[PDB]
From Swiss-Prot, chain B:
Disulfide topology: C6-C26
Family: Belongs to the ABC transporter superfamily. ABCC family. Conjugate transporter (TC 3.A.1.208) subfamily.
Designated gene of the protein: ABCC8
Subunit annotation: Forms an heterooctamer with KCNJ11; four ABCC8/SUR1 molecules interact with one KCNJ11 homotetramer.
Localization, UniProt: Cell membrane
Membrane-crossing segments per the record: 31-47
Protein name: ATP-binding cassette sub-family C member 8
Domain of life of the native organism: Eukaryota
Sequence ranges on the Extracellular membrane side: 1-30
Organism: Cricetus cricetus
Protein's job: Regulator subunit of pancreatic ATP-sensitive potassium channel (KATP), playing a major role in the regulation of insulin release. In pancreatic cells, it forms KATP channels with KCNJ11; KCNJ11 forms the channel pore while ABCC8 is required for activation and regulation.
Carbohydrate-modified residues: N10
From Swiss-Prot, chain C:
Coiled coil (residue ranges): none
Lineage: Eukaryota, Metazoa, Chordata, Craniata, Vertebrata
Post-translational modification: Phosphorylation by MAPK1 results in changes in channel gating that destabilize the closed states and reduce the ATP sensitivity.
Role description: Inward rectifier potassium channel that forms the pore of ATP-sensitive potassium channels (KATP), regulating potassium permeability as a function of cytoplasmic ATP and ADP concentrations in many different cells. Inward rectifier potassium channels are characterized by a greater tendency to allow potassium to flow into the cell rather than out of it. Their voltage dependence is regulated by the concentration of extracellular potassium; as external potassium is raised, the voltage range of the channel opening shifts to more positive voltages.
Subunit organization: Homotetramer; the homotetramer binds four ATP molecules (one ATP per subunit). Forms an heterooctamer with ABCC8/SUR1; one KCNJ11 homotetramer interacts with four ABCC8/SUR1 molecules. Interacts with ABCC9/SUR2.
Protein name: ATP-sensitive inward rectifier potassium channel 11
């Protein structure tokens, strides 16, 4: 419609796949699919797995008792293989007791028939296997940290202002939790339908972008909010963005990828956000945020994304660097 | 003379459920304890985390 | 939202208390349910009668 976003502001992407030759890999990764599922759906499969297993073996216990004929009334002329089985519902309760390992012991397993002994072995092994598998799935779900990515907070929209003479595309990212993100990393990409002289056409060319770090690396130590900018050098594809060329249907998008292993669970998480063409404010520096109180600092997240207007030329970066060079040479 | 939720007097016969269980004047009181012990034990884990 | 991550950040004393409260709350809530269902079933008043208890 108006303009498709590659990744939504909340971090979820919007790309739609089509014409996939389903090889069953979606079904093949049973354990991975369970982890992805929501907790209500996980609990439904959890309940259905146990209930189906309990009911399946309950029918088997009823079947073996019916075949042995020990459920019909008897007077001392018989010894049932599973004691006190005089109804199907008794077999159902017996199945619960075995697999859950409750073992009330009112419905025992006698030494008489060997088939019930084999079925008891099978039910115990199957119960342990399913318990172990559900543990694994629950342990991977309780170790999920995608809900940690939500606590990572970016500015509502980014700016482009002059700093140290040159021009840079600024940005702010914040963390709300008290915990730390070990080995953090901020990638940054521009997504443009970039045409090439040789004749190629790319529907969405993803150009990587440096983080303008001190040592030219991707490492970032994120405790307070930081003005994470990108120096618009000659090679930067943002070198030719006219401020007059900032309107809606300008084919632009600034991906941001904040990575880093969460300290608590030890799981790595991504944070994503895309700045559109009309979501950029030219020449507006960010409001200072990190105040100081008595013996301690103070971050004012109320002013997290407020930007004040600062004067700057309304010229493309090419029209700025070239002009400055000519003036210096003439002088 | 131990503790009884219903009345121990008259040989502890307030527990019979004849003529419907909703007519057992003690039982309706037990039905009125379920919602309260539901919220106590569904929010104490919630509150103690905070 | 991330209760699990929140539980990890808790100290061991508070984690033990929440561990204890979680088990105790589930145990006692279902104790009421078992007590109430038996009481409604009428198998709680003792006697040598035709009734057969649901939970002995
Ligand atoms: C296994 C149950 C058997 C029957 C017994 C019923 C009695 C239930 C009480 C005891 C339950 C045990 C409590 C354990 C506490 C664990 C907490 C937990 O797992 O997270 C609480 C959950 C998480 O929801 P979420 O954040 O939306 O899910 C993750 C996210 N959406 C994601 O995609 O990562 O938040 C919830 O989800 C609420 C948890 C309450 C559990 C109630 C389960 C019944 C669900 C019925 C849903 C029917 C309709 C489903 C439609 C879903 C459509 C999407
Ligand atoms: C406090 C209980 C609230 C739920 C009551 C029952 C609701 C049934 C829900 C069934 C699905 C139908 C409607 C869905 C409602 C979803 C609720 C839900 O997700 O919140 C549960 C919470 C928080 O999760 P969230 O951040 O809101 O999730 C993402 C959300 N969807 C979003 O907007 O992004 O998740 C958490 O943060 C963890 C909550 C776990 C609660 C466990 C309580 C302790 C139980 C211990 C005793 C067991 C009692 C057993 C009784 C059995 C009786 C037979
Ligand atoms: C500045 C603090 C502000 C106040 C906030 C907390 C308040 C705490 C009060 C301070 C005194 C606490 C004394 C508790 C003594 C018993 C508990 C116990 O032995 O565990 C104590 C220790 C953990 O200590 P820590 O220094 O917190 O741990 C170091 C780490 N940096 C951390 O904090 O994490 O534990 C471990 O190192 C783990 C061992 C686990 C083994 C325990 C097994 C049995 C537990 C008991 C279960 C039965 C409970 C019975 C309840 C019955 C209810 C009816
Ligand atoms: C979750 C259940 C617990 C609650 C159950 C409530 C309903 C009672 C069902 C019932 O009595 O089952 C009956 C059958 O039952 C069947 O044949 C069940 C058929 C469906 C089972 C498979 C479902 C999938 C009991 O059958 P039985 O005990 O074999 O009948 C002979 C009894 N006699 C030996 C005393 C003469
Ligand atoms: C699972 C979690 C626990 C379940 C809750 C307890 C279930 C037992 C409730 C008993 C109950 O409601 O009694 C019925 C009356 O209900 C009614 O008449 C409905 C209103 C009361 C419930 C709301 C019986 O009905 P009755 O008195 O006719 O039973 C006698 C002849 N069978
Ligand atoms: N629509 C699709 N969905 C899923 N996988 C695909 C799809 N198209 C191609 N692939 C995968 O891409 C690889 C080969 O792609 P390509 O289309 O170039 O060759 P191909 O003729 O489909 O290959 P093959 O004979 O190995 O299936 C294979 O691993 C194939 O499974
Ligand atoms: C109290 O239970 C008794 C039955 O056990 C009933 O009434 C009692 O009848 C005996 C007769 O000897 C005496 O104990 C009293 O006359 C009654 N006991 C009382 C009034 O406590 C009756 O089922 C119950 N009482 C009432 C009022 O319902
Ligand atoms: K046991």
């Amino acid at each position: 419609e108006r303009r498709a976003r590659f990744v939504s502001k909340k971090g979820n992407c919007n790309v739609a796949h089509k014409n996939i030759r389903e090889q069953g890999r979606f079904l093949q990764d049973v354990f991975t699919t369970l982890v992805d599922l929501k907790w209500p759906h996980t609990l439904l499969i959890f309940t259905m797995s146990f209930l189906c297993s309990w009911l399946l073996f309950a029918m088997v216990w009823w079947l073996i008792a019916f075949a042995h004929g020990d459920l019909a009334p008897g007077e001392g002329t018989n010894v049932p293989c599973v004691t006190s089985i005089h109804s199907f519902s008794s077999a159902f309760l017996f199945s619960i007791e075995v697999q859950v390992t409750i073992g009330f012991g009112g419905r025992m397993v006698t030494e008489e028939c060997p088939l019930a002994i084999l079925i008891l072995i099978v039910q115990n092994i199957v119960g342990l296997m399913i318990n172990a598998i559900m543990l694994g799935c629950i342990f991977m779900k309780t170790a999920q940290a995608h809900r940690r990515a939500e606590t990572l907070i970016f500015s509502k929209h980014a700016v482009i202002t002059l700093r140290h003479g040159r021009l840079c595309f600024m940005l702010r990212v914040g963390d709300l939790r008290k915990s730390m993100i070990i080995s953090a990393t901020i990638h940054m990409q521009v997504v443009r339908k970039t045409t090439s002289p040789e004749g190629e056409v790319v529907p969405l060319h993803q150009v990587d972008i440096p983080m303008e770090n001190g040592v030219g690396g991707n490492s970032i130590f994120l405790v307070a909010p930081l003005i994470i900018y990108h120096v618009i050098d000659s090679n930067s594809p943002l070198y030719d963005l006219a401020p007059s060329d900032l309107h809606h249907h300008q084919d632009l998008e600034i991906i941001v990828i904040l990575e880093g292993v969460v300290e608590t669970t030890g799981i790595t998480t991504q944070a994503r956000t895309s700045y559109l063409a009309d979501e950029i404010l030219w020449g507006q520096r960010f409001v200072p945020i990190v105040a100081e109180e008595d013996g301690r600092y103070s971050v004012d997240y109320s002013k997290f994304g407020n930007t004040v207007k600062v004067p700057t030329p309304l010229c493309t970066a090419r029209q700025l660097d070239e002009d400055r060079s000519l003036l210096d040479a003439l002088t | 003379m131990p503790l009884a939720f219903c009345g121990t007097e008259n040989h502890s016969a307030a527990y019979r459920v004849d003529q419907g269980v909703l007519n057992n004047g003690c039982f309706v009181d037990a039905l009125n304890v379920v919602p309260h012990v539901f919220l106590l034990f569904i929010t104490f884990p919630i509150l103690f985390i905070g």
